[PDB]
């Protein structure tokens, strides 16, 4: 267990922050939700130098740049397979790069991680479906989706799977089970809601929690990509079902202020999605 070492030693860990505001500020345009592939290919320092911007402002695990990054979304950018999971590859090399810049500069930064983004088959609809769930895939057809994804971050080295924005049930199930046929891998489930019990596909988060409760490489349960507001009643819920370390990185407003209720809510990862910047990641750190 990746986590077990840091959480032994502190009640907080936190996360990275967004990843396309941070290119956007040092001139990156991001035309479109493939982004990625042109960044990895074209401007794949600047990725590096965000992971380094965020390790510095307090973040204790960086999260790559792999949402959106699968064979099946990059095939519309003439991309096969293996052409795909070499950029997968890519974007963990990148991160632990810059683990090893920093670890380089603060020796004594304590330990740090490197989780693989694993986002969800609406990502790839590219139709906002991340935040609604109302798609049908076969058990397989999700499995065919994400394995060549899961393959590639773990063998680039990702300590942990950061299976993130998921709004639909059945493919987190397929996920948990796709995560079995690799017994090393260690995985975080964060989840996108339709209110503070359910699930965006309508599951009510008791039966997601009694699901993944019986996978023993789900180490870490939450939820990301959700306002600030519904944060607090969301995890306040998970905490009544389960004694798991809680995930938490919402989107952009103050995000920092949050951070004793998140934790008395059993939190211990703590980041920000969408609009948030190393800023977030300070005041955390600061407050913590
Ligand atoms: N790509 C983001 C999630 C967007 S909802 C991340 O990797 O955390
Ligand atoms: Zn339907
Ligand atoms: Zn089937
Ligand atoms: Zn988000």
Redesign the pocket.
């Known amino acids: 267990n990746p986590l077990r070492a840091l959480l032994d030693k502190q009640d907080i860990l936190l996360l ?1 922050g ?3 505001t941070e290119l956007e500020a040092r001139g990156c345009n991001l035309a479109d939700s493939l982004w990625s592939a042109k960044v990895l290919v074209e401007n794949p320092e600047l990725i590096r130098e965000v992971h380094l911007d965020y390790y510095r402002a307090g973040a204790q695990c960086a ?6 990054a699968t064979p099946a979304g990059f095939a519309a950018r003439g991309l096969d397979e293996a052409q795909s999971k070499a950029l997968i590859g890519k974007s963990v090399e990148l991160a632990r790069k810059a683990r090893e810049a920093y670890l380089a500069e603060n020796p004594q930064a304590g330990t740090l991680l490197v989780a693989g ?1 694993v ?1 969800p088959y609406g ?1 790839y609809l590219a139709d906002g479906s ?1 935040y609604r769930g109302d798609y049908h895939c076969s058990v397989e057809a999700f499995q065919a989706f994400h394995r060549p994804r899961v393959e590639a971050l773990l063998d680039a080295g990702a300590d942990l799977l ?1 299976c ?2 998921l709004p639909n049930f059945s493919e987190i199930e397929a996920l948990a089970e796709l995560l079995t046929a690799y017994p090393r891998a260690r995985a975080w489930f964060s989840f996108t809601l339709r209110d503070s019990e359910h699930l965006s596909d309508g599951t009510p988060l008791r039966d997601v929690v009694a699901l993944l409760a019986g996978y023993p490489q789900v180490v870490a349960l939450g939820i ?2 959700i306002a600030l507001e519904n944060t607090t009643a969301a995890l306040q819920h998970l905490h009544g079902l389960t004694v798991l370390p809680l995930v938490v ?1 919402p989107n952009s407003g103050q995000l920092a202020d949050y951070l004793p209720q998140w934790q008395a809510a059993g939190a211990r990862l703590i980041g920000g ?2 609009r948030t910047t190393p800023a977030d990641i300070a005041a955390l750190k600061a407050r913590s």
């Open positions: 990275d967004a990843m396309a999260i790559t740049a792999s949402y959106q983004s986002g990502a991340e950061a993130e924005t990301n990509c990185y999605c969408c």
